[PDB]
Amino acid sequence: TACCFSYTSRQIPDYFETSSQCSKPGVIFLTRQVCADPSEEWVQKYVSD
């Protein structure tokens, strides 16, 4: 049960939605397991989705 405290600034190159209450929202990305925000990279999960 993840809760993302800091995102990666650089979007690159499955998913999760931290919005289970949590401190903040986020998209954990399996790849490591790297953390994201809501800005443009929503391509990958909403564009490649």
Interface residue list for other proteins (CB under 8 A): 1-10, 12-13, 22-23, 28, 32-35
For residue 14, the minimal CB distance to other proteins (Å) is 15
For residue 29, the minimal CB distance to other proteins (Å) is 9
Q: What is the dihedral sign for C-alpha 49, 8, 26, 38?
A: negative
For residue 21, the minimal CB distance to other proteins (Å) is 9
Residue closer to other proteins (CB basis): 1 or 47: 1
β-partners of residue 7 are: none
Torsion angle defined by CA atoms of residues 24, 48, 12 and 19, in that order, rounded to the nearest 10 degrees: 10
